[PDB]
Amino acid sequence: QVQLVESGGGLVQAGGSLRLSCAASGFPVKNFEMEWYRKAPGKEREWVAAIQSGGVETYYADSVKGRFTISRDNAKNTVYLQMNSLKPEDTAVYYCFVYVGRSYIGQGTQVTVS
């Protein structure tokens, strides 16, 4: 019933920009909290972002506060996040994450900064 479909990744260099997507099925995004996670190669899975269920307040981890912009699209049922000022530390597989009854994991998309 619930599936998260990641896209929008790619290969950029240092100082690049990108626009990811997380296509979602089975739930409106107005009712639950969504999150973004990433997993670098050789590193464990780390949290990236969140938008709350009211749609007002967003958060980020300490490496990614202020540089990225996460947004929701309500009619599309897809949650994006904007990449700007891409350091090579952001080389990871990016997973969008949601708690709708059971918490569910997408297969992710690849962003390489080099």
Binding site: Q1, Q3, S25, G26
Partner: protein, 49 residues
Amino acid sequence: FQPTNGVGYQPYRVVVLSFELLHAPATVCGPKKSTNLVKNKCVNFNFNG
């Protein structure tokens, strides 16, 4: 696509039975099996509905 091509060069015929999750009614599935019946025995039965 020549007849003296190899199995890597000759076409593997691909069909994609796509699956998505959108607000649409279910139309095409796979089949449903059904076992044999015995008679003169207290058994639970499940007919079509």
